[PDB]
From Swiss-Prot:
The gene is rpoA. Induction: 3-fold repressed by starvation. It comes from Mycobacterium tuberculosis (strain ATCC 25618 / H37Rv). Signal peptide: none annotated. DNA-dependent RNA polymerase catalyzes the transcription of DNA into RNA using the four ribonucleoside triphosphates as substrates. The lineage of its organism: Bacteria, Bacillati, Actinomycetota, Actinomycetes, Mycobacteriales. This is DNA-directed RNA polymerase subunit alpha. The N-terminal domain is essential for RNAP assembly and basal transcription, whereas the C-terminal domain is involved in interaction with transcriptional regulators and with upstream promoter elements. Homodimer. The RNAP catalytic core consists of 2 alpha, 1 beta, 1 beta' and 1 omega subunit. When a sigma factor is associated with the core the holoenzyme is formed, which can initiate transcription. Transmembrane segments: none annotated. It comes from the Bacteria. Belongs to the RNA polymerase alpha chain family.
Amino acid sequence: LPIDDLDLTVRSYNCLKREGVHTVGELVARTESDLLDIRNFGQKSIDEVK
DNA sequence: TGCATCCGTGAGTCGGGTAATAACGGCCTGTACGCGTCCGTTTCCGGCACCCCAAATGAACCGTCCCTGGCTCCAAGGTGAACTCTGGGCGACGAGTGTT
């Protein structure tokens, strides 16, 4: 499933589509620590992803 | 009346082919073959009596497969504002450190 299908807000889509994350399969493959590593990552994005 | 004297059957199994004599004219014919000629056949040149036969030459011609006309009623391009990062800009604070 793509991350857009999760019907989320501005920042998470922006910071994901620049770097080529297209699905939630790679997102569930990546752990919370491996996804929070990104510079200027929103804590609200962390909350919604968790 | 023996008695020698023939005399009549064996005896199994799956490389070829090796020769003589007096005979000689002359006539007949006979069946097969070789000549010259004539007639039925048959096969075409071009003719009709016409058989007409026909693809090609005028129509419509009407439905239909293309043009032009106007009309929408909407969903995409144009017009807003914010905001959550996104990024840079500002500022203060602290020990490892250039020096005699």
